[PDB]
């Protein structure tokens, strides 16, 4: 159906190597060993309830929102909107607890089922079909700011 924005949490996101996600000078989501590291995870209610729907955005001189458009991860220059009319959206991810790693998170693209945000070694945030159980690269520590 459609999505409606609820509350936001300010968040630092780390991969399995304890590296911090950041938006670089070229608007690329990268990981490194501060405002370009502060991510806004906005929760959305869904009229077709399937799981915790979120957008991930960051304020670094303007607001950029993470997108899985074209099966590539990038930032778009936009505020996460109050309503998203699409059933699937390039800016919506379903956030879950990781099976067996109960303090860790994974983010599934709502646009491309079974594809996940993943850290890939530059250290990039990429989008990744999960092909294997216990793939650590799709697991994240999401720390409260």
């Amino acid at each position: 159906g459609y999505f409606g924005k609820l509350e936001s949490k300010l968040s630092v996101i780390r991969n399995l190597n304890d590296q911090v996600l950041f938006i670089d000078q070229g608007n690329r989501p990268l990981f490194e060993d501060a405002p370009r590291t502060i991510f806004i995870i906005s929760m959305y209610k869904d009229s077709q309830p399937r799981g915790m729907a979120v957008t991930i955005s960051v304020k670094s001189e303007k607001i950029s929102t993470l997108s899985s458009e074209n099966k590539i991860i990038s930032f778009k220059e936009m505020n996460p909107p109050d309503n998203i009319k699409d059933t699937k959206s390039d800016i919506i991810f379903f956030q879950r607890s990781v099976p067996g790693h109960d303090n860790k998170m994974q983010f599934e693209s709502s646009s491309y089922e079974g594809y996940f945000l993943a850290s890939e070694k530059l250290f990039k945030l990429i989008l990744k079909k999960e092909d294997e159980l216990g793939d650590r690269s799709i697991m994240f520590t999401v720390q409260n700011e």
Partner: protein, 108 residues
């Protein structure tokens, strides 16, 4: 002091005059959880809608979040003041967490 497991969410909807009271609990990563209401005209083929898109005669209050004994409870009141308008609507309370979603239906 009950020596039994806790079921979550144990979703329940209680009715009072003009109101539906939804309650449910979450234990795991409670900060990432929310509750909201939905409604569908079962007499028509309109989509399920958020409460704020139903027009007059209905509204949902902000969720109330409490914690006890390591368990967070969410409660959310839906006020249906025009019971005529919504006589043929199915209402659904939704609780969303990091483990998934739970829903419970009710009708007037």
């Amino acid at each position: 002091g009950a020596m039994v497991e806790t079921k979550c969410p144990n979703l329940d909807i209680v009715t009072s005059s003009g109101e539906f009271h939804c309650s449910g609990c979450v234990e795991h990563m409670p900060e990432f959880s929310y509750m909201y209401w939905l409604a569908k005209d079962m007499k028509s083929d309109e989509d399920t809608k958020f409460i704020e898109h139903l027009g007059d005669g209905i509204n949902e209050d902000e969720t109330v979040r409490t914690t006890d004994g390591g368990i967070t409870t969410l409660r959310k009141v839906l006020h249906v003041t025009d019971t005529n308008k919504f006589a043929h609507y199915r209402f659904t309370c939704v609780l969303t967490t990091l483990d998934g979603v739970s829903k419970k239906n009710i009708w007037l």
